[PDB]
Design a protein around this ligand. Sequence first.
Ligand SMILES: [Zn+2]
Ligand SMILES: [Zn+2]
Length: 92
Amino acid sequence: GSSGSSGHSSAQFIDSYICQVCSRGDEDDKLLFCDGCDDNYHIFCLLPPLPEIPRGIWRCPKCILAECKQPPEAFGFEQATQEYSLSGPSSG
Ligand SMILES: [Zn+2]
Ligand SMILES: [Zn+2]
């Protein structure tokens, strides 16, 4: 029959990292993380490829090649990070 007003039961958990070029996992040991889409990319899958895991922040080509040159439909205000939980205002 019917119930009225539905749609409120969708759960999913993903705690794994799969490359976006070869679709592997055992290579996670050398998997990189993008600071925009949180993806997984190896050092021998990119182009040009990399020598090994980077130090600072590393980004993927799927994001850089997009932000680099985009059409007139992505102009506005930047995002705003969430507050910080330090637990301990002031100091004296
Ligand atoms: Zn790969
Ligand atoms: Zn990315």
